[PDB]
Design a binder for this molecule. Structure first.
Ligand SMILES: Nc1ncnc2c1ncn2[C@@H]1O[C@H](COP(=O)(O)OP(=O)(O)OP(=O)(O)O)[C@@H](O)[C@H]1O
Ligand SMILES: Nc1ncnc2c1ncn2[C@@H]1O[C@H](COP(=O)(O)OP(=O)(O)OP(=O)(O)O)[C@@H](O)[C@H]1O
Ligand SMILES: [Mg+2]
Ligand SMILES: [Mg+2]
Ligand SMILES: [Mg+2]
Ligand SMILES: [Mg+2]
Ligand SMILES: [Mg+2]
Ligand SMILES: [Mg+2]
Lengths: 309, 309
């Protein structure tokens, strides 16, 4: 078995380190530049690779800066089998941060237009690659012009393989995944609104209702932790208090760690502790994806989990 | 004869267009991306090329993204003969702007370390290329580790050719150029402080004193225009009022136009009107280098020049 991530809109993140705050209408000299991979699915692959668990990244990348993207992926130990879009470049996301502050300003390019041929190639690739014993994680919003209809086809193609399907998406894409029937979703506190019943005020009740259609339902609540519904049980997960530096990417780390736990057949409570420990470590870091495996293994032991009756 | 520009720290400018103001600690989606050349000397070359006047750009560029830089230069009709630094990349300067606002936030990378071999190659190149009937314009601060001593050697090498030498530099580099003896400098209102005599309060008097050592002295004053000293005369140059959008690069356009005027043997007052007209047109534009040759030719006719007795 293996875990596949699907990144429909990959990116190359260029971290621009400056001194102090980012002042608009002013000159902000860059002290140093670092690179990381962009696209939620790739971040999830990076997390899985840190665990050493077998995984492969799928998606559509631009031909013009393919060597650069691949070089970054090798630095992250991410194995891949990307489809390539000729005459285009994988988008670049500029992330401005400082060793003096906690924030991060993100300036992302939108992404390119995927050809129908490549949309079709991805489906054929999934059909021949993915087996029922595998796990597939789709994360991140589709690139421009990759319609709801296209996403529906993608979800259906994955469902036909019998593989476990997890989706960390938002808006209409998240709504569709839930309607279609997926195994796992992790909307954060704001994203979950898209699938909430307006006439049902209680968040717990809404979660218990949605749990009827989703095997592993996680609603993440930032520093408050998360609430997870599984096998008719509801868990309130609380992380230990950590010194936050940058909570960007905390969700991607949570998803990667959660999936890793499931892949290793860890009981749901342990999987939740591992995911929470890893994401807590992430928030302690400057960038938007890194985390300390050492700190996480300890933090996992300081996560409280209480079943809500 | 020909005009040579020297850009010791070239760059590739990536213009990132967003909606509204650049909000720090927030996500600022890029609507579109455009490219331009960076490095003051290259901007001056771009201006000269718009005039159709013969010119060639010199300097040291990185090998790793040379094709990209050259592609941009061809788009600007800039002829060049750059030295190349192996294993390095020409720095990228990120410029965030919007069709909704007037500002521009600049996030520039510092530049690479030039090898002694290339510092020496530039001097040998200048010695064999430049003739006494030529004009040489050095603009922009040197890259990291390109010392005052290195700059002194550069200025001396240019002086030995007999060519006209113009310098649009600041700080210690500007001070050195003046001490060394150059034909033209254009410090703006803030930069001129570096060469002012603290015990001499009057700006006019300071300019008249410095004019003893500089044939063509221009102190630019932004929207107020400029003051130029030449052949024992002092000129107050006032531009027509224009709707400012982005005054970044107004100085580079002024320098390119001023040099073009001198190359065409235009009387000093006409040269000043042309430079002022072009820079006024530049300030009306969004980016940091473009200007309308059509608007400038008209604006030039609405520039007032009064001799200060
Ligand atoms: N300040 C914090 N302290 C401890 N843990 C945190 C903090 N912020 C986030 N986390 C952990 O990370 C998980 C990821 O969470 P959040 O709900 O912010 O995800 P998200 O907003 O989707 O993330 P992303 O930025 O990747 O989209 C949380 O449920 C939590 O366990
Ligand atoms: N608001 C304006 N209206 C009309 N003309 C202007 C305006 N701002 C600048 N200029 C013109 O452009 C010339 C270039 O000027 P300024 O003194 O700002 O240069 P600078 O700050 O060195 O430029 P740069 O941004 O290239 O470094 C001015 O002397 C003036 O003639
Ligand atoms: Mg994405
Ligand atoms: Mg969050
Ligand atoms: Mg998220
Ligand atoms: Mg420069
Ligand atoms: Mg100015
Ligand atoms: Mg200037």
């Amino acid at each position: 078995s293996l875990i596949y991530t699907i990144t429909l809109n990959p990116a190359i993140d260029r971290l621009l380190f400056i001194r102090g705050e980012l002042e608009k209408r002013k000159t902000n000299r860059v002290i140093k530049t670092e690179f990381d991979c962009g696209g939620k699915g790739l971040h999830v692959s990076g997390v899985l690779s840190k665990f050493g668990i077998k995984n492969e990244a799928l998606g559509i990348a631009g031909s013009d800066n393919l060597d650069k993207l691949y070089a970054i992926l090798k630095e992250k130990h991410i194995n891949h089998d990307f489809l390539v879009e000729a005459g285009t470049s994988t988008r670049e996301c500029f992330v401005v941060l400082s060793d003096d502050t906690n924030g991060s300003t993100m300036i992302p390019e939108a992404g390119f237009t995927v050809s129908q041929t490549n949309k079709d190639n991805l489906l054929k690739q999934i059909a021949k690659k993915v087996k029922k014993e595998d796990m597939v994680v789709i994360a991140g919003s589709p690139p421009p012009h990759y319609t709801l209809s296209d996403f529906k086809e993608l979800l259906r193609t994955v469902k036909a393989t019998g593989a476990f399907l997890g989706c960390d998406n938002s808006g209409e894409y998240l709504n569709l995944a839930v309607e279609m029937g997926v195994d796992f979703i992790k909307p954060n506190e704001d994203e979950v609104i898209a699938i909430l019943d307006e006439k049902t005020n209680s968040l717990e009740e809404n979660i218990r209702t949605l749990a009827e259609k989703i095997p592993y339902l996680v609603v993440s609540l930032g520093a408050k932790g998360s609430i997870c519904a599984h096998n008719g049980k509801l868990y309130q997960v609380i992380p230990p208090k950590v010194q936050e530096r940058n909570d960007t990417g905390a969700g991607d780390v949570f998803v990667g760690a959660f999936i890793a736990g499931l892949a290793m057949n860890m009981p749901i409570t342990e999987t939740l502790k591992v995911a929470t420990g890893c994401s807590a470590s992430k928030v302690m870091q400057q960038d938007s994806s890194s985390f300390d495996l050492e700190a996480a293994g300890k933090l996992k032991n300081q996560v409280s989990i209480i079943q809500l009756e």
